[PDB]
Design a protein around this motif. Structure first.
Motif, short mmCIF file in Angstrom:
data_model
loop_
_atom_site.label_atom_id
_atom_site.label_comp_id
_atom_site.label_asym_id
_atom_site.label_seq_id
_atom_site.Cartn_x
_atom_site.Cartn_y
_atom_site.Cartn_z
N UNK A 74 0.68 -1.68 -0.24
CA UNK A 74 -0.31 -0.09 -0.25
C UNK A 74 0.92 1.14 0.08
N UNK A 75 2.25 1.34 0.57
CA UNK A 75 3.25 2.45 0.12
C UNK A 75 4.01 2.41 -0.52
N UNK A 76 3.66 1.60 -1.65
CA UNK A 76 4.82 1.30 -2.98
C UNK A 76 4.59 3.18 -3.39
N UNK A 77 6.06 3.04 -3.85
CA UNK A 77 5.85 4.79 -4.13
C UNK A 77 6.30 4.30 -6.04
N UNK A 78 6.54 5.27 -6.41
CA UNK A 78 6.44 4.79 -8.30
C UNK A 78 7.52 5.48 -8.74
N UNK A 79 7.94 6.72 -8.11
CA UNK A 79 9.26 7.47 -8.01
C UNK A 79 10.43 7.41 -6.82
N UNK A 80 10.22 7.09 -6.24
CA UNK A 80 11.25 6.72 -5.17
C UNK A 80 11.66 4.92 -5.24
N UNK A 83 8.85 0.80 -0.88
CA UNK A 83 8.57 -0.35 -0.61
C UNK A 83 8.21 -1.06 -1.77
N UNK A 84 9.44 -1.74 -2.62
CA UNK A 84 8.23 -1.98 -3.66
C UNK A 84 8.65 -3.42 -3.50
N UNK A 85 7.61 -3.92 -3.67
CA UNK A 85 7.47 -5.64 -2.99
C UNK A 85 5.91 -5.22 -3.46
N UNK A 86 5.20 -6.52 -4.38
CA UNK A 86 3.91 -7.42 -4.33
C UNK A 86 3.93 -8.49 -4.05
#
Ligand SMILES: [Ca+2]
Lengths: 213, 56
Positions: A74-80, A83-86
């Protein structure tokens, strides 16, 4: 993977390939119905391919399973890329054997210096032995771009690294999944080792999410 | 044509392997390149049609 080596056939049984027409990302099997990958690997339709070695040839050990649910942190940031996990829940449980197995989630965060194994198709599966780097060096290589949810793995002199096609793939150290291939500036460039999602900060989110779905 | 159409394709820092289209001014048409999955620039299209419409 640059400067790596072809993995021994089926020696990384937890490795999966994400395919939506062609291979576009990797992932890891953590239980018979769930796969963990990178959030930037999101696609509305994904087919998971397990037991693969050569992605371009039907070998006989493969299992093809469609994704039933795709859940990004829920806290994934497409720019930074923080939290790049799925998590991907499979349409049906897979059959576990010598070619298809799960990888354990971390019991704790592995310390810098720990040797790990990185794998991916970035057409045979490639392997790379590399250590987790000190956070200080990671930060020095990527000024102001590293968060506490990221860890660098590789070599400061470059030469060996994960590359396009490896995202979402595993970084396993001492039998536990410690990282997920995420990003980096170029591949295998000096002073820019690969950056990975630090899995140990998400064990509870992973377990709680699986229990609620 | 727009200035972003003359910029080389940008793979980006992410490591996915996503095939996208970009306008190759030097060749005069849209070709494919590997996009990493994040921080795309404008010379990046999901289809040849949109690429040629925007940068043609
Ligand atoms: Ca195969």
């Amino acid at each position: 993977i640059v400067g790596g080596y072809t993995c021994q056939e089926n020696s990384v049984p937890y490795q999966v390939s994400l395919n939506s027409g062609y291979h576009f990302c990797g992932g890891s099997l953590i239980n018979d119905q769930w796969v963990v990958s990178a959030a930037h690997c999101y696609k509305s339709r994904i087919q998971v391919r397990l037991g693969e070695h050569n992605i371009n040839v039907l070998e006989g050990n493969e299992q093809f399973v469609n994704a039933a649910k795709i859940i990004k942190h829920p806290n994934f940031d497409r720019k930074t890329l923080n939290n790049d996990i799925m998590l991907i829940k499979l349409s049906s449980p897979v059959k576990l054997n010598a070619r298809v197995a799960t990888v354990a989630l971390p019991s704790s965060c592995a310390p810098a210096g720990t040797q790990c194994l990185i794998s991916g198709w970035g057409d045979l599966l490639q392997c790379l032995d590399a250590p987790l780097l000190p956070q200080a060096d990671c930060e020095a290589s990527y000024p102001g771009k590293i968060t506490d949810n990221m860890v660098c793995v590789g070599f400061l002199e470059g030469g060996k690294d994960s590359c396009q096609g490896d995202s979402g793939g595993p970084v396993v150290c001492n039998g536990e999944l410690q990282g997920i291939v995420s990003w980096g500036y170029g591949c295998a460039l000096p002073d820019n080792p690969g950056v990975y999602t630090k899995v140990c900060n998400y064990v509870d989110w992973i377990q709680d999410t699986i229990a609620a779905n | 044509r727009p200035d972003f159409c003359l910029e080389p394709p940008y793979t980006g820092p992410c490591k996915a392997r996503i095939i996208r289209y970009f306008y190759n001014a030097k060749a005069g048409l849209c070709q494919t390149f590997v996009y990493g999955g994040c921080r795309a620039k404008r010379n990046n299209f999901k289809s040849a049609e949109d690429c040629m419409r925007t940068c043609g």
